Amino acid sequence: GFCEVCKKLVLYLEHNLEKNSTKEEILAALEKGCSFLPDPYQKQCDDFVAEYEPLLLEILVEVMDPGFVCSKIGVCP
Amino acid sequence: GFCEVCKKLVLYLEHNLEKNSTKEEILAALEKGCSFLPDPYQKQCDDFVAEYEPLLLEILVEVMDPGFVCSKIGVCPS
């Protein structure tokens, strides 16, 4: 029943990473996390984000495959 | 290199998913997805979200493990 809408919703969220406002929000959240570290770790954390934010998102989307996610909660085979 | 700050940042993100503001943002994002559907499909989508969104959030929290993420992107050992 819910199998197809679950997969569409996971895909919707993952494609919405292309939206400008979503990109701004993700980068802001990453910068906020780095901001609570002391020097020199804050700067090192900012450098890490600048290099690895794309791969971080790519890996998260990879792991959150719609079929895997939606079968894990039991609405899809 | 970046291994130590990666784990600190992913720990932050893991706990940030548990904030009420973040939980509300994720729920609202899913509900916005449903809003693009015409009737009766929007209601079916809303029903799914109402029943299952906390289980979806749990899966996202589980993925956001510092050791897992930081080794998957290649900055930390396993």
A positions 55-74 inside 8 Å of B (CB): 55-56, 59-60, 63-64, 69, 72-73
DSSP string, chain A: --HHHHHHHHHHHHHGGGSHHHHHHHHHHHHHHHHTSPTTHHHHHHHHHHHHHHHHHHHHHHHT-HHHHHHHTTS--
> Does residue A77 belong to the interface with chain B, where contact is any CB pair within 8 Å?
no
Specify the amino acid at residue B50: A
**Distance between CA atoms of B56 and B71, rounded to whole angstroms?**
23
Asked if B12 and A36 count as a contact pair (C-beta separation under 8 A), the reply is: yes
**What is the CA angle B73-B22-B42, rounded to 5?**
100
Q: Which residue matches tokens 């929007």?
A: B42
Whether the CA torsion B1, B7, B12, B13 is positive or negative: it is positive
Task: Tell me which fold the domain B1-78 belongs to.
Answer: NK-Lysin (1.10.225)
> Does residue B76 belong to the interface with chain A, where contact is any CB pair within 8 Å?
no
A59-76 burial by CB neighbour count: b if 16+ within 10 A, else e? Answer: bbbebbebeebbebbebb
Using what technique was this structure determined? Answer: X-ray
Please give the DSSP secondary-structure letter assigned to residue A38.
P
How many Cβ contacts (< 8 angstroms) between chains A and B? 78
**Distance between CA atoms of B1 and A68, rounded to whole angstroms?**
32
Asked whether the beta carbons of residue B16 and residue A37 sit closer than 8 angstroms, the reply is no
**Distance between CA atoms of B71 and A19, rounded to whole angstroms?**
28
Instruction: Give the residue extent of every domain in chain B.
Output: 1-78
Resolution in A: 1.6
> Does residue A35 belong to the interface with chain B, where contact is any CB pair within 8 Å?
no
- What kind of architecture, by CATH, is found in domain A1-77? Orthogonal Bundle (1.10)
3-state secondary structure of A75: coil
Runs of H (alpha helix) within chain B: 3-16, 20-35, 41-63, 66-72
Token pair for residue A1?
Answer: 């029943």
Please list every residue in chain A whose beta carbon sits closer than 8 Å to the beta carbon of residue B8: 33, 37, 41, 45
Token pair for residue B54?
Answer: 């906390």
**What is the CA angle A21-B4-B20, rounded to 5?**
45
